[PDB]
Amino acid sequence: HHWGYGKHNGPEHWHKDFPIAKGERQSPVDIDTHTAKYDPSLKPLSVSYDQATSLRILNNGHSFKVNFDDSQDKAVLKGGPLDGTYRLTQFHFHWGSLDGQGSEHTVDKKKYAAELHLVHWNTKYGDASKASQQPDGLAVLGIFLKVGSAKPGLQKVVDVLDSIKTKGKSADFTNFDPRGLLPESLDYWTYPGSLTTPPLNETVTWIVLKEPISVSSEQVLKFRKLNFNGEGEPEELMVDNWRPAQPLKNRQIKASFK
Ligand SMILES: NS(=O)(=O)CCNC(=O)/C(Cc1ccc(O)c(Br)c1)=N/O
Ligand SMILES: NS(=O)(=O)CCNC(=O)/C(Cc1ccc(O)c(Br)c1)=N/O
Numbered sequence: 001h002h003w004g005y006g007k008h009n010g011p012e013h014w015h016k017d018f019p020i021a022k023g024e025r026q027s028p029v030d031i032d033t034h035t036a037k038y039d040p041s042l043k044p045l046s047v048s049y050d051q052a053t054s055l056r057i058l059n060n061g062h063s064f065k066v067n068f069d070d071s072q073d074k075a076v077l078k079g080g081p082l083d084g085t086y087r088l089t090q091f092h093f094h095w096g097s098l099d100g101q102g103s104e105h106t107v108d109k110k111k112y113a114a115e116l117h118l119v120h121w122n123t124k125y126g127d128a129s130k131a132s133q134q135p136d137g138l139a140v141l142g143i144f145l146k147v148g149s150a151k152p153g154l155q156k157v158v159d160v161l162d163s164i165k166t167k168g169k170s171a172d173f174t175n176f177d178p179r180g181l182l183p184e185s186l187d188y189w190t191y192p193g194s195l196t197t198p199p200l201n202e203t204v205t206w207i208v209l210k211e212p213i214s215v216s217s218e219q220v221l222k223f224r225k226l227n228f229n230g231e232g233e234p235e236e237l238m239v240d241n242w243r244p245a246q247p248l249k250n251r252q253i254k255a256s257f258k
């Protein structure tokens with residue numbers, strides 16, 4: 001559809017094409033750290049990315065996305081709130097026009113410069129399409145970016161963005177190691193939610209890491225040179241491609257840590 005992030009087609013309009021936008025399990029949310037409860041029943045979280053096979057990087061007009069070979073269990077997420085095995089299929093980012101906005105989730109109303117989403121599907125459903133329609137079909141590992149020191153493991157991403165400036169452009173992006181995007185700690189919050197983009201399916205278990213990664217000003221500036229538009233269309237910078245916090249409704253956010 002013709003959805004985006006501007007005044008005329010942004011988050012406040014999405015519900016007309018996607019009525020679930022006003023649903024009971026929408027994402028992102030504000031994470032009230034004082035209301036979230038430590039849950040001793042959460043099993044250890046396992047991020048097993050050694051065997052990841054990145055493939056290409058694409059500007060799809062909404063973000064940039066790195067896809068992975070998810071034809072076998074290579075790079076997988078298990079444990080924590082999850083039952084079974086979830087296979088990494090892609091990552092992408094959301095970011096702002098200024099260093100003080102850009103994240104989708106917020107922490108005690110704090111907005112970060114950007115947010116990384118590592119998207120995984122439950123292998124019990126066989127493919128990512130079928131999984132996208134199940135209430136336990138998807139798991140997104142969310143990681144905040146704050147501006148400070150450079151993140152070396154982000155630099156290869158940063159350096160290819162020039163080659164995918166406009167919507168529809170892709171490039172090779174093999175041999176990228178997503179472990180380089182993680183913070184030290186795997187402490188997290190978890191809640192049941194949705195895709196934060198149309199079609200807004202209520203099929204995601206969210207796992208949001210507490211520790212942000214630090215990226216440099218120069219790194220995030222390069223995100224902001226991307227374009228929402230296609231080649232030889234007029235320039236609209238790809239910035240502020242984030243959905244704001246949605247009503248929590250009757251959900252509980254659980255913490256993995258005391
Ligand atoms: N390796 S890939 O080709 O990038 C994988 C593409 N699929 C995915 O990201 C997903 C989640 C998803 C993303 C956007 C959507 O609109 C819907 Br619905 C589901 N699969 O469920
Ligand atoms: N934000 S999310 O809840 O983690 C998962 C939903 N969003 C995304 O995957 C993306 C990249 C993307 C956008 C449209 C697509 O058709 C496909 Br495929 C991937 N957002 O820009």
Ligand code: NA
Binds near residue numbers: 184211212
């Ligand atoms: Na960090």
Ligand SMILES: [Zn+2]
Binds near residue numbers: 093094117196
């Ligand atoms: Zn996302």
